[PDB]
Swiss-Prot record:
Recorded GO CC terms: azurophil granule lumen; extracellular exosome; extracellular region; extracellular space; specific granule lumen; tertiary granule lumen
Gene: LYZ
Record EC number: 3.2.1.17
Species for this entry: Homo sapiens
Disease: Amyloidosis, hereditary systemic 5: A form of hereditary systemic amyloidosis, a disorder characterized by amyloid deposition in multiple tissues resulting in a wide clinical spectrum. AMYLD5 primarily affects the viscera, and the predominant clinical features are renal dysfunction of varying severity, and intra-abdominal bleeding. Inheritance is autosomal dominant.
Protein name per its UniProtKB record: Lysozyme C
Keyword Metal-binding assigned: no
Disulfide bonds listed in the record: 6-128, 30-116, 65-81, 77-95
Gene3D superfamilies linked to this entry: 1.10.530.10
Catalytic activity entry: Hydrolysis of (1->4)-beta-linkages between N-acetylmuramic acid and N-acetyl-D-glucosamine residues in a peptidoglycan and between N-acetyl-D-glucosamine residues in chitodextrins
PANTHER family the UniProt entry points to: LYSOZYME C
Length: 130
């Protein structure tokens, strides 16, 4: 599923993302935009370490989910990476929350640092009623 902007804004809000561990909704929106273009079945293979980035938040298999084919990986979110390719994003949101509970927080994603950090991201939620 490829979400419309405001459609995603309200979906994330209903899932408890607005201000989670201090991260505004607009930051979560900006992250999803640059990571996947709001596409829940987006995937990216990294031949180097045999890992794959899954879903709307492009969460990596070396640490967060199990796909069975990533050498010496772990499963911190305790989910099959398939759960991160569902049209319903509740499981992906639970995993993104687990990711930010680590030391780096939202900085865990390099795309956030490049396209969202030190910028006014309010434009991602403007007009969505959130
Ligand atoms: Na894994």
């Amino acid at each position: 599923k490829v979400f419309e902007r405001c459609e995603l804004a309200r979906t994330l809000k209903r899932l408890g993302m607005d201000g989670y561990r201090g991260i505004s909704l607009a930051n979560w929106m900006c992250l999803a935009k640059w990571e996947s273009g709001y596409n829940t079945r987006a995937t990216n293979y990294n031949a180097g370490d045999g890992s794959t980035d899954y879903g709307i938040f492009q969460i990596n298999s070396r640490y967060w989910c199990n796909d069975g084919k990533t050498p010496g990986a772990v499963n911190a979110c305790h989910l099959s990476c398939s759960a991160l390719l569902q049209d319903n994003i509740a499981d992906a949101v639970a995993c993104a929350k687990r990711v930010v509970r680590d030391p780096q927080g939202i900085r865990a994603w390099v795309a956030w640092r490049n396209r969202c950090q030190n910028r006014d991201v309010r434009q991602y939620v403007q007009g969505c009623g959130v």
